[PDB]
Amino acid sequence: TGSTDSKARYMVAYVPPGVETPPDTPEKAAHCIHAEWDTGLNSKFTFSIPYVSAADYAYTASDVAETTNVQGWVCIYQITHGKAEQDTLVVSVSAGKDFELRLPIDPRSQ
């Protein structure tokens, strides 16, 4: 959502489970599945977080026992920018084409 005179280059990476902590730099994260893009005429970039797991389905809820996340992390980096100090990147999420939910439950406290 920056002004015309502000530019930036970003990177998004999907980090699977298997490491202690998420990578803090684009360089370490480059070895993961990732996409890089810069700002321009088109203001929006969409990226698919892939389903990569041992089992065919994953739980929607997270258990108290699991310390580090079971499906991994998403890391968003700024490679660099030009005069973009107060300009923002709005992030939203939608379901992908093969996204699927199964086994209805009624979990909320009532």
Binding site: A35, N42, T46, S48, P50, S94, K97, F99, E100
Partner: peptide, 27 residues
């Protein structure tokens, strides 16, 4: 996928963009 965000036209990108393969879904 790069698009014009302001128009609010739905955009559904897929894993094929980076070599993956979209699966079958049962909804």
């Amino acid at each position: 996928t790069t698009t014009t965000g302001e128009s609010a036209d739905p955009v559904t990108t897929t894993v094929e963009n980076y070599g993956g393969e979209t699966q079958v879904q049962r909804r």
